[PDB]
């Protein structure tokens, strides 16, 4: 039966639904049968975030991930404190309202606070007054059903303020021996271990990126260094490794030794493919398709066809706007290291290609579908961050790659031009004859292969 709620003059969240304040999508919430909100006013979004009829975890999860584009943390807290503070209407009516409206609504604002403090604690780390107000509000909360949730929120706050498999494969070694960090290089370390240790770094770098660094396309704006530092460390490592692979190639002036270098890198690619490190796969593909490397026809001619074919299928992952990459990522199960670039573009273009507001009968409504669409991409990013790799860290090999600096003190253009001028030197532009260059490696060039040495 229809329930009597207070007037909008005293309580804003009692205003009835209309085309001017809340609209929905045609379909219904997957797994739950709940309407999908397309757009609404902030008051209507807060009402639905703390709805009395039912709990809406997906909307809560979406809201708290993307609300900062349309509402400030300080403003949201005020709104949820306003929501909680329910005045009784101006008996059968009052007893049912207390059990069917006040208790469910007050209980749902406490779930929001809990989810906020647990999953988006950064809002409180960056605004101590926001945490004073949250802790203050939570102190005023009294009741039988509340004590349980009020104590859980307090136990999360103090924890946040304080601050598992079988045996992994044996570490593989080639010419360089354990501890002899001074000899470590592309051809001296084992190609399986280079690919494993790079996959561990790249997996940790991938896992460290949070949605606070992605929502609002903040990695593309002036404060990107402040707001997206883990994403940027991650992209920079990737860029470093691509440039290192190119440097290794073009600074190996002897053709036979250079053929050994390109082959070894394709072996590192083959192991990245095995390990589902698509970041790694594309680091190698990007180095191979770079202007200095691509043009080395005398080098690729002498590469075995098995390795050419391996490189060819890895290249095709990037073709037709990452069609095969996308399909292959959906077909595999973790652990994996996705290529982040696609996610970055999709979030940017979603946010730049859709309006912040929709207008119905002259009134402005927040476009929540735009926000949901972004939370879907960040959710997919997080689904691949749960699973770790069952591979042992080799601390010296790890540190070797962490400390690579192929550019040195040079700027991008300087270094890029040097790599290209080395490419033209080692293999001149036709019809200039192919010169010969002395060998630079005292050790053997033959690979140990990509198949483990022991069981």
């Amino acid at each position: 039966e229809q329930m009597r709620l207070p007037s909008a003059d005293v309580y804003r969240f009692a205003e009835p639904d209309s085309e001017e304040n809340i609209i929905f999508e045609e379909n219904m919430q997957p797994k739950a049968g709940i309407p999908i909100i397309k757009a609404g006013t902030v008051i209507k979004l807060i009402e639905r975030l703390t709805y009395h009829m039912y709990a809406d975890p997906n909307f809560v999860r979406t809201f708290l991930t993307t609300y900062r584009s349309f509402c400030k943390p300080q403003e949201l807290l005020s709104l949820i404190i306003e929501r909680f503070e329910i005045p009784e209407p101006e008996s059968a009516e009052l007893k049912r309202f207390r059990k069917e409206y006040i208790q469910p609504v007050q209980l749902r604002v406490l779930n929001v606070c809990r989810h906020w403090v647990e999953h988006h604690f950064y809002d409180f780390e960056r605004d101590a007054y926001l945490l004073q107000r949250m802790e203050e509000f939570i102190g005023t909360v009294r009741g039988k059903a509340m004590k349980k949730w009020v104590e859980s929120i307090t136990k999360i706050i103090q924890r946040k303020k304080i601050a598992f498999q079988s045996s992994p494969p044996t570490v593989e070694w080639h010419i360089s021996r354990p501890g002899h960090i001074e000899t470590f290089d592309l051809l001296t370390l084992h190609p399986i271990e280079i690919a494993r240790q790079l996959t561990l770094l790249e997996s940790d770098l991938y896992r460290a990126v949070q949605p606070s660094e992605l929502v609002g396309s903040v990695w593309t704006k002036e404060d990107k260094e402040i707001n997206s530092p883990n994403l940027l460390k991650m992209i920079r490592h990737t860029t470093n490794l691509t440039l290192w692979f190119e440097k290794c190639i073009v600074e190996t002036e002897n053709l036979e030794e250079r053929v050994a270098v390109v082959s070894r890198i394709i072996e590192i690619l083959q192991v990245f493919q095995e390990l589902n490190n698509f970041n790694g796969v594309l680091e190698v593909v990007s180095a191979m398709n770079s202007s200095p490397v691509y043009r080395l026809d005398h080098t690729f001619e002498q590469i075995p066809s098995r390795q050419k074919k391996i490189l060819e299928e890895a290249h095709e992952l990037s073709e037709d706007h990452y069609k095969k990459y996308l399909a292959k990522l959906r077909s595999i199960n973790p652990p994996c290291v996705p290529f982040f670039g696609i996610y970055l573009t999709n979030i940017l273009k979603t946010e730049e290609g859709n309006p912040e507001v929709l207008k119905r009968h002259g009134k402005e409504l927040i476009n929540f579908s735009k926000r949901r669409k972004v939370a879907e991409i960040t959710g997919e990013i997080q689904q691949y961050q749960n699973q770790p790799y069952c591979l042992r860290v080799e601390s010296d090999i790890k540190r070797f790659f962490e400390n690579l600096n192929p550019m040195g003190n040079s700027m991008e253009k300087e270094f890029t031009d040097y790599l290209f001028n080395k490419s033209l030197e080692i293999e001149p532009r036709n019809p200039k004859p192919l010169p010969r260059f002395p060998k630079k490696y005292s050790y053997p060039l033959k690979s140990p292969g990509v198949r483990p040495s022991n069981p």
Binding site: S217, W219, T220, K221, E222, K224, L232, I235, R236, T238, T239, T242, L243, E246, L282, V285, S286, A287, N289, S290, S291, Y294, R295, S318, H321, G341, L344, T345, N346, I347, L348, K349, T350, E352, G353, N354, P355, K373, E412, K413, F420
Partner: protein, 167 residues
């Protein structure tokens, strides 16, 4: 089979370059873009009577993956070199983007277009004349566009298709 033109958008990040392609692909009265679907980067168009398909690659948001530019650029037959009229650094970055394209395609004559985008109501720092002068020095067209109104968007892309066709 109708002709397919592989077009690549290159330009500075942080200055709303994505609007150029988004506005082309989305219908002039629709503002509901999903970058996930295939139709989001493919468009069947009629230019000078000859019907064709435009495939547009815009890696907007991947600027920090600087070592992937060569790869991305080699995909294209024609390039839209995009700067924002409200940001002089994005205009100053065009010279190196062009040099990089020439190197990737191993050619001094690559079908290319210079696009000046008006992304917001912020003040203009790049006078049309400066950009008109830069374009003439490279021997390519110059098209200005507005992200708010969709003005110039179609001319930018169509002008590039004609640069490819007349190559």
């Amino acid at each position: 089979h109708m002709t397919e033109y592989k077009l690549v958008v290159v330009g500075a990040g942080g200055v709303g370059k994505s609007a150029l392609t988004i506005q082309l692909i989305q219908n002039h009265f629709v503002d509901e873009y999903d970058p996930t679907i295939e139709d989001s980067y493919r468009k069947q168009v009629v230019i000078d009577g000859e019907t064709c398909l435009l495939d547009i690659l815009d890696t907007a948001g991947q600027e920090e993956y600087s070592a992937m530019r060569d790869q991305y650029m080699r995909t294209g037959e024609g390039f839209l070199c995009v700067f924002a009229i409200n940001n002089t650094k994005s205009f100053e970055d065009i010279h190196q983007y062009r040099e990089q394209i020439k190197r990737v395609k191993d050619s001094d004559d690559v079908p290319m277009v210079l696009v000046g985008n008006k992304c917001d109501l912020a003040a203009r720092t790049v006078e049309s004349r400066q950009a008109q002068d830069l374009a003439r020095s490279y021997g390519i067209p110059y098209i200005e566009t507005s992200a708010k109104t969709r003005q110039g968007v179609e001319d930018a892309f169509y002008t590039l298709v004609r640069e490819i066709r007349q190559h």
